[PDB]
């Protein structure tokens, strides 16, 4: 019930046009915990089951061993959307402290928050 | 034609369920310029025409004087999505250097990238 940043969920991204996005599939919570409590929506980063390997610095690799997702996947930090909390179906796992820093660094690159 | 970070566009957020999001309305480009060139999609932050005043630190105020939007508005940095570039209709203006830093600071709060 409590939505925390770094948690791996399984929301319904559909219907989102055009390409890339689809139906019920895993995401990761990137919204801060203060907004995670009181906002009616949540910011999620996409988890792709397609060609799964870090292609760019805005990609972070996650494994089907430690995380309940199907096959080896990649966090898409260049593919983001904000969902109303009612779209989250069920939670899977949560990211490690070291894997969350990997997301925190790639997220500042795709948003150009460095320099 | 070149999409730059901080530019104010006018994309078609529809169809995005459930509430809050609607049809053709202004956004601001928050994706970094390296991804702005070669990615098929772009990350945008919502511009709301509703109750327009900074309510939380993830809000940034923008004016209808300097910017071609209708009435005084607010940048919603807690309401984000990634659009395929074909959804951008026409560009309006671009944010000032000082107003972009206001967005850059509020964006790190809603994503919990500080501490």
């Amino acid at each position, epitope marked *: 019930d409590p939505i925390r940043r770094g948690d791996v969920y399984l929301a319904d991204l559909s219907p989102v046009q055009g390409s890339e996005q689809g139906g019920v599939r895993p995401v990761v919570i990137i919204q801060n915990d203060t907004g995670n409590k009181y906002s009616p929506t949540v910011i999620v980063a996409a988890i792709t089951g397609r060609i799964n*390997k*870090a292609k760019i610095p805005t990609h972070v690799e996650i494994e089907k061993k430690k995380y309940k997702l199907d096959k080896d996947s990649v966090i898409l930090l*260049e593919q983001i959307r904000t969902l109303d909390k009612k779209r989250l179906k069920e939670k899977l796992t949560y990211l490690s402290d070291d894997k969350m820093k990997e997301v925190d660094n790639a997220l500042m690159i795709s948003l150009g928050l460095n320099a | 034609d070149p999409i730059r970070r901080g530019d104010v566009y006018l994309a078609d957020l529809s169809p995005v369920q459930g509430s809050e999001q609607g049809g053709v309305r202004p956004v601001v480009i928050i994706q970094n310029d390296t*991804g702005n060139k*070669y*990615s098929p999609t772009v990350i945008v932050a919502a511009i709301t025409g509703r109750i327009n005043k900074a309510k939380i630190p993830t809000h940034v105020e923008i004016e209808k004087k300097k910017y071609k939007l209708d009435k005084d508005s607010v940048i919603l940095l807690e309401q984000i999505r990634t659009l395929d570039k074909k959804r951008l209709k026409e560009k309006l203006t671009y944010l000032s250097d000082d107003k972009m830093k206001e967005v850059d600071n509020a964006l790190m709060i809603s994503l919990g990238l500080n501490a």
Partner: nanobody
Amino acid sequence: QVQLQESGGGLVQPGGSLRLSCVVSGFTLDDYAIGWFRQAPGKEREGVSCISSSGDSTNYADSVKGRFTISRDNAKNTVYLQMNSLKPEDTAVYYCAADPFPGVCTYASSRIYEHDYWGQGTQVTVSS
């Protein structure tokens, strides 16, 4: 269709030079980023350098910058890797690999990410 093939391997003395070529087939060279990956025995595969699908951005590894220079000729569908100041520790099997992902090798990074479509290897040795 068919893909890549590397040529130009051989034996060199320490401090020598060599130019590796990479022929491309079965796709447009302007649609794929091409990278160079070497693999020494007993060691994990190491990325060396990549070219963007457009050609405006080039990245290299720290142990390489100032020595190897990646180049592309779109008219020939041929990618080059000019290897200079060759150390005996550069002995490995070099591969040129293509990847159809948008934005690959565009960011300025010291790490080249693994590609998807590979080619036949080439042997580069360097010792007295």
